[PDB]
């Protein structure tokens, strides 16, 4: 019921509000682009952007038996995906906002109740990118890496394990070999190594180490 619409322009709020009720009437191409626009800038939104995108396709297919909105969204998103390498250089926060949005789409936006296969390999492309020694320097990237492995870790590993093993090797390698990692950088990585080892659950001892521990 909470969609986090409040970040938008007042007249754009109405656009999204009436899109949830009547997608047939409203321009679905602009609805999609506006969503993608805001989620690349706002991370608090990029997480809840999955929620709203789903409900729209839900409403659209139930009203006009069409997927016009979904395709407008995916084309737009893929356009952003292809270019990520460039977007990375440009600005960090926009790039991690992108990953966040890709992953939160994969999470909530489902087809006939199943995760879209099309985004499985892409989502793994971002994670593998976030796993590179140049990217494990940057502590803001590692932040975004583990949040996803937290949110959709189990799900991805289920789609493809092979790629997950591969990815968790890079994480092991970065820890064992890489020189320059932020203090959290190192702390956030061990947690997730233990998270997966437990079966995407964090043991009680771990909880405390990470969540109640105090550092001077």
């Amino acid at each position: 019921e909470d969609y986090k619409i409040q970040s938008f322009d007042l007249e754009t709020q109405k656009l999204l509000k009436t899109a949830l009720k009547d997608p047939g009437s409203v321009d679905l191409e602009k609805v999609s682009s506006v969503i993608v626009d805001q989620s690349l800038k706002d991370q608090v939104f990029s997480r809840e952007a999955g929620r709203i995108c789903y409900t729209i396709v839900q409403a659209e297919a139930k009203q006009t038996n069409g997927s016009v909105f979904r395709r407008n969204l995916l084309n737009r998103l893929q356009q952003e995906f292809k270019a990520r390498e460039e977007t990375r250089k440009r600005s960090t926060q926009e790039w991690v906002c992108l990953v966040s949005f890709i992953c939160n789409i994969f999470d909530y936006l489902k087809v006939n109740n199943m995760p879209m296969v099309a985004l499985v390999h892409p989502v793994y492309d971002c994670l593998f990118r976030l796993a590179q020694s140049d990217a494990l320097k940057n502590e803001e990237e590692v932040d975004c890496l583990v949040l996803q492995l937290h949110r959709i870790g189990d799900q991805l590993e289920k789609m493809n394990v092979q790629l997950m093993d591969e990815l968790f090797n890079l994480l092991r390698d970065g820890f064992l070999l890489q020189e320059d990692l932020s203090s959290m950088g190192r702390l956030l990585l061990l947690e997730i190594l233990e998270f997966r080892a437990g079966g995407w659950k964090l043991s009680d001892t771990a909880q405390k180490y990470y969540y109640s521990e105090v550092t001077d």
Binding site: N75, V111, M116, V117
Partner: peptide
């Protein structure tokens, strides 16, 4: 519409539309 994401999803839907 060759490597199109939107296409690949449309096809996943239809693959399920056939029961």
């Amino acid at each position: 519409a060759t490597d199109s994401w939107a296409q690949a999803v449309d096809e996943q839907e239809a693959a399920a539309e056939s029961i």
